[PDB]
Structure formats: structure tokens, C-alpha cells
Nucleic acid binder design. Structure first.
Lengths: 43, 44, 117, 112
RNA sequence: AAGAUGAUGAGGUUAAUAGGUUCGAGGUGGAAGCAUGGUGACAUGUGGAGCUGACGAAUACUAAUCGAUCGAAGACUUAAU
RNA sequence: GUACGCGAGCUGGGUUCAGAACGUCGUGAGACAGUUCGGUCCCUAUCCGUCGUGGGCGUAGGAAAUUUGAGAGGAGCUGUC
RNA sequence: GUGAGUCGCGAAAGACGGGUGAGAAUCCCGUCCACCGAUUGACUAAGGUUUCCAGAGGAAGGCUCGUCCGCUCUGGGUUAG
RNA sequence: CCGAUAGUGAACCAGUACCGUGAGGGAAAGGUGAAAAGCACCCCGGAAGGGGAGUGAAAUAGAACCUGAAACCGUGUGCUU
RNA sequence: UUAAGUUAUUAAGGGCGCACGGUGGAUGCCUUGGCACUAGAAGCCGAUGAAGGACGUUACUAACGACGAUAUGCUUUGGGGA
């Protein structure tokens, strides 16, 4: 329904340890000298 | 629904207008009160 | 099997896609739609290499009754050209064209995006 | 040495950006360009404009080379708050709080 | 074969993982077209025909690339040795 | 027995509402030892708890497999011939 | 500030191509598909009072975006025996 | 006697903007600098914006411009977990 | 090498303190404007058409103010002197 209490600064931050994003995996082109994704296309 | 205030210029140009107010002592008094303050607008 | 939308909208989508891809022989879409249409169009070329009446009578069950064409100041309704030009290419070959290219993502929807041929 | 480049009161909230910063807080430059340019987010391209500017002036004014450069510290801070309303049932309202950000990036060779 | 996600499991070209192909199982119940006979609606023969989602064998024909990351070098003391 | 177990799980027939009527008491407004038809049941679950499922670290070098059982839980019915 | 990157994002069928553009699920053209059809169609009156047209813009709004707009700037548009 | 949440309700385009049909009710809102000398010109970018450059005694006084606290929000790190 | 025993390192992330920014606009200083009073003056206008308003006038004017188709003011007399 509702909270009873002010969520602190701490558990607010502990609640967010897994809010990240895993960086993409990249690969330099075959002789075009720049990165792009794996099993994707370069554009 | 039918909401209130289905407007019309004629009834408004009437009752809440001027010539009524300036055709009754009461209305004259009203316009006075609206002057001593200083109001840009009358009959509205 | 796979679901994009409701039932009718699904098949009419597909009919517009295989009816597409054939004026201009390559498109760009979400990835999934490319997969189910992969299945479909492969069934089409495998069908299109017979040439029977009944093959036309069966192919029309998804293509659109009308799709005008102009390439060399000429005319083709996606079916003339199918059964004159397309199967002619892949006579030697088995059904199993239609590669897929994971072209890239999209910005507004975060959508994956592709092209197929 | 050092170098920096800033945007000011650009129209994105901090958090949604703050992530994309913590991707690259430490790494070499062009690797970071790669890291930004791909991620399916609206917060990315802007920041590439920022960083790219930091390289422009880091070369023009301070006479550096792109090789030894990394991102030692980058961050975002709050800006003003565009306060707006949404209507809501039974006459009430509940006011949106649109926010902004003052993005800050600081290149460094680390050397002198 | 698992499943909300992630996880799990089969697989990733030295390859049958999925798709398609050809076959098949089962389902459906005699395709269109032709010919015949009926003025006709209709039937008969072509013919267990033809069609077929998830199912099942062979088939690399297509796509599973290339690439990147993480990850130990063995504490001390005593007793055997 | 556990808020005569449980309404942030359900229902609302009853019941402490507004209407109306019967008997009765009251001069009257109106009210009952009573009776009768109808009469709106809100909530996006924060913490604890619970059901399930995962990441990190540790388990004196780093990994793939297999397994013991400290303990815990579930099962425990009965008839006829 | 927390709640929370959560609830919701206000009925409904769109898809493709080509262009413009710093940049397009959403903008313009074309193509098909679908929806209303005693009516989401058409002419009027009340009512509102410049929203109308064209050219430029895209910080604010527009429940996303936006090269676009009933938004911003400049100019222009309403004729009665 | 006040020196900007005080004093007028109002230090500024105030009985205005706005709410109401209408009597009527009714706001908030001060400070660049000595002087505007208000950042030529260069670089990045579409612009916004920024860094350089310079004016000025000073720009961490550059117009959402004297000072600029706290809440709140981040960055980094010495001890610890 | 073998056994027995003890101990730590880790920090995903958080904590305490220190430094540096950001928001936001308290405090400090100031004042254009107000408050209450003194002394004095004055204390009503209007058919000779009031008070108050509308609409319009500046080369460029959206508003305030001035003004009224002689319109962002005309003539006169006095003062001032750029």
C-alpha cells in the first residue's frame, strides 16, 4: 500500500548495486579500423 | 452530461451588464465599489 | 511458429511483406518478422519452381491481387515475374535462400533491426 | 596536463546519464567513443559531442596528442527543475518535476 | 527437453543447433484441370488424390563469423618426514 | 482456541444510516419487546515474514565431475468379501 | 527529498519503398492493407474569436521522438440593392 | 519607524495575471559593474553550449549576472567492513 | 612431502572523516517605495455638459504616460540659455 518510513540514503544505494548495464562486446572491423558489435553489422 | 454555464452573449450582455447596473441604485453603488479599488473592467 | 500481433493482422502483415521484398528484393525490419517471413518466402520459391496452374492458384493465396511494377517501362504483378524470373534463377538450387543480416539496432524503440534478401 | 569540456542545463535527468558515465570513468578515449556510440540510449550521442569537443580544444589550445589521453574524472550535476502539472482525477493534480544536467568531462594526459 | 528475466540444457563450421529441402508418421477426407453423362443444378474417372502448425530421419543450401574478457604460481607454527 | 482464526484475501443475506409501510405508545414532532421491500465494501505492498529464483565473497594454490549426511521436511487413512 | 527509474504513457491495424535531414517506429510523396458509412461523411446555427494561408524555427507544449504542428517569428487573408 | 516571507495588498506595466457566470476574492516577483567598457577574433558543434582569447582591479562579477549558507546530489580518497 | 592448529588477504557495495563541485536563494550591506505624525494650505465638480472610461494620435509603436481629428500637442506672456 504505502511505506511507513523514509528510505534512507544507504539502502537506496544498496538497492541499486545491480542497476548497472553490461557494456557491449565489440570488435574491430576486418580492415576498416573501428569497433562494432559481435555478430552484428557495421553501418 | 450537461455541464453548467452553457454560455450566451445576450444574457451576459444583459443581466451582468451595464444598463441594468446603471438603471438601478444598487447597481450604481456596485460600479462605485468597482471604481474606488480601481478595476480595468466592469460588468464581468 | 511465433506471434507478433493478433491473428488476422499477422497474416496480412506477412502477405504485405512477401508481396514486398520482391519489387525491391530487400527490406529492413525488426528481426523476428524477418524470420517468419523467411519461412514463408522459402516456401514460395520452393513452390514457384513447379509452374503449374495449381501452383499459381496456391501462390495467390498470400500475394496481393495487385501490385504494379515498372522497371524498364514495363509491367509485372509480382507473379508473372515470380514464375518467369525468380524461380528461373534458383532452378539449379534448393529452397534455402534468404540470409539474414543483423544490421543494427534502432533508436526510438530500442528495436533490433535487420535486412533480408 | 588536463583539459575539459562542458554542457550546461541540457535536457536529460542525471541518473539515466550517470550510468553511461560510469561505463567510461577511467578508460582510454577512442575506446570510450566506441562505448558510447553503440549503446541504445538517448544519453549517449550528446556526450560524444561533449567529449569530442574536449578533444578539439585539448589539441587546439593545449597542444596534446590523442594517444596518452584517458578519462580520469567525469560527472554530472543537477541543474534547474522545470516544474509542470498533470491533471488527475477528482480535480487533484500531481506535478511533474522535469530536470536538467550540467555534464562535465575532464581529459588528462596525466603528464606535464 | 528450460523459461518472466537471468538461470538451466542441447549447439556454435573439425558443425545437423534452428530454418528450408526431400521423404515419412498422423490428420483431412477424392484437389484443381481435363473428359464423360446429364437442358440443368450435379455426379462419375483421372486418384487414399491433393493439402498439411509445432512431430520424426538424411540433407550445410542459408545463419550460428571474426573477436574480446576473466581466471592460480600455493602463509605461518608445531608433530611425522 | 488462534481479534467469538482470517474482509490492505472474497462475499454483504443480516446488521448501527437516509426512503416507505404494518401493529403499538405518544395529542405531536416521532420512537420501538418488534416486523417488512430496497439500500456504493477504496488501496500501484515500503520493512518484517513467506514462496521461488539469481549475482558477490569465503571455504589456504586455481578448475570439471561425483557424493556422504549434520540436520530439516512429506508421507502415516481405512472398508468389503 | 524518499516511494521510483516504479504506475501510467487516455479505446482502435498498420506494413514497405523513396526522399528530406546533423540526426527519422512517428515528417512529406507513392504503394498496398484495414476501419466508419442514418455516419468519425457534407451544409448550417449557437458558442469560441484569428486558431485560417505561405515562408522560415524547433528552447518551451505535444504524456515518447520530431526535420512537424491548433506551438514561436515575419508577412497576408473575411468585399452583398 | 520598515529595509524585500517586513513595510501598502502592491519598491518592478498591480487590484494586474489568474479563479468565479456575478457581487467578489486575489497573487508572486528588488540588486552586474566605476562606467556597458555586455566577452572582436580562433577551435568543437546543427544550434544551444563550452574552451581559448581578450575588457575590466577582479568574469569562481558574463545577464536564470554582489555575497551565495543548509537540505539534497555527486566525484575521490586516509581507517574500516 | 604428510598431519594438527591459527591467521589474512577480497569490497561487489555501503560506513566515518577530509577535500572539490553542483542545485537552491537564507544571511550581510543597500533602496526606487511605504508607515505614522507636525506646521501651514485646501476641502467639492457638473446641461458653459462633470468624475470616470472607450477609441485613436509619434517615421519606426505591443503597452504606460501626455494628448484629442489643430491629437506623443498649438498660440501667448514671463524664466532659463544649450
Amino acid at each position: 500500500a504505502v511505506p511507513k518510513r523514509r528510505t534512507s540514503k544507504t539502502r537506496k544505494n544498496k538497492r541499486r548495486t545491480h542497476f548497472k548495464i553490461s557494456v557491449p562486446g565489440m570488435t574491430e572491423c576486418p580492415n576498416c579500423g573501428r569497433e562494432y558489435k559481435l555478430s552484428h553489422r557495421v553501418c | 452530461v450537461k455541464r453548467t454555464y452553457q454560455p450566451n452573449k445576450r444574457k451576459h450582455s444583459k443581466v451582468h451588464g451595464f444598463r441594468k447596473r446603471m438603471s438601478t441604485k444598487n447597481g450604481r453603488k456596485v460600479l462605485a465599489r468597482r471604481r474606488r479599488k480601481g478595476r480595468k473592467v466592469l460588468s464581468a | 511458429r511465433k506471434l507478433g500481433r493478433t491473428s488476422d493482422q499477422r497474416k496480412a502483415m506477412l502477405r504485405d511483406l512477401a508481396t514486398s521484398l520482391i519489387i525491391s528484393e530487400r527490406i529492413e525490419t525488426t528481426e523476428a518478422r524477418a524470420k517468419e517471413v523467411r519461412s514463408v518466402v522459402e516456401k514460395l520459391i520452393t513452390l514457384g519452381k513447379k509452374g503449374d496452374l495449381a501452383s499459381r492458384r496456391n501462390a495467390a493465396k498470400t500475394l496481393r491481387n495487385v501490385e504494379i511494377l515498372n522497371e524498364d517501362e514495363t509491367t509485372q504483378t509480382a507473379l508473372q515475374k515470380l514464375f518467369g524470373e525468380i524461380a528461373e534463377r534458383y532452378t539449379e538450387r534448393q529452397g534455402g535462400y534468404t540470409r539474414i543480416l543483423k544490421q543494427g539496432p534502432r533508436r526510438g524503440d530500442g528495436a533490433e533491426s535487420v535486412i533480408i534478401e | 596536463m588536463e583539459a575539459k569540456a562542458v554542457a550546461r542545463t541540457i535536457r536529460i535527468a542525471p541518473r539515466k546519464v550517470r550510468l553511461v558515465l560510469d561505463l567510461i570513468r577511467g578508460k582510454n578515449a577512442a575506446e570510450a567513443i566506441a562505448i558510447l556510440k553503440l549503446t541504445n540510449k538517448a544519453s549517449s550521442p550528446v556526450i560524444e559531442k561533449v567529449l569530442m569537443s574536449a578533444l578539439a580544444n585539448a589539441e587546439h589550445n593545449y597542444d596534446m596528442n590523442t594517444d596518452e589521453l584517458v578519462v580520469k574524472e567525469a560527472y554530472a550535476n543537477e541543474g534547474p527543475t522545470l516544474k509542470r502539472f498533470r491533471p488527475r482525477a477528482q480535480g487533484r493534480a500531481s506535478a511533474i518535476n522535469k530536470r536538467t544536467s550540467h555534464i562535465t568531462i575532464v581529459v588528462s594526459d596525466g603528464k606535464e
